[PDB]
């Protein structure tokens with residue numbers, strides 16, 4: 001159930017998965033392929049928990065995790081994507097975004113920070129940004145975490161999912177009620193995408 005718990009075997013599985021993640025990093029580094037991981041969800045959904053578990057055994061030299069907050073005034077002097085462009089990883093490196101550019105079609109939309117034209121146009125803008133990256137030597141995965149203006153958020157999220165879920169930049173939905181499930185799920189999904197990419201290129 002969502003009201004389920006798993007244990008002890010969890011701990012063993014986590015370690016294995018975490019080590020598999022280390023191996024992934026080694027691959028990414030060697031083949032100079034960047035990884036951008038996006039975590040979006042409502043507060044208390046377990047984003048940060050998942051992030052911690054994902055990179056526990058990864059070398060800190062290899063990754064940077066970015067907490068994303070509302071744009072400050074100096075950020076508003078440029079286009080909305082610029083902040084993210086500055087925080088992009090170099091090839092071989094991992095960038096994790098706690099919240100992200102998807103803010104445009106989520107919070108900004110709900111709280112009226114973005115005009116309707118602005119947020120309506122954004123899905124395609126975002127898709128085009130991600131494609132510029134994915135066409136080259138970046139991998140992107142996006143994670144949404146749900147725990148049982150909340151209705152308005154679900155509506156916004158769905159449209160996000162419809163318009164911006166793409167093969168090269170998938171949206172993965174994770175049930176967060178059991179934190180352990182979620183942490184395992186995030187690791188499993190991250191690893192699989194990387195393996196499929198390794199297959200797409202002739203690697204490992």
Ligand SMILES: Nc1ncnc2c1ncn2[C@@H]1O[C@H](COP(=O)(O)OP(=O)(O)O)[C@@H](O)[C@H]1O
Nearest residue numbers: 041042043068069070071099103104107108113
């Ligand atoms: N572009 C953005 N505009 C405003 N807030 C943003 C933006 N990107 C991220 N945020 C974060 O979202 C917070 C607003 O609450 P939010 O998480 O969107 O809703 P909820 O609490 O209902 O899940 C801000 O305090 C900030 O941490």
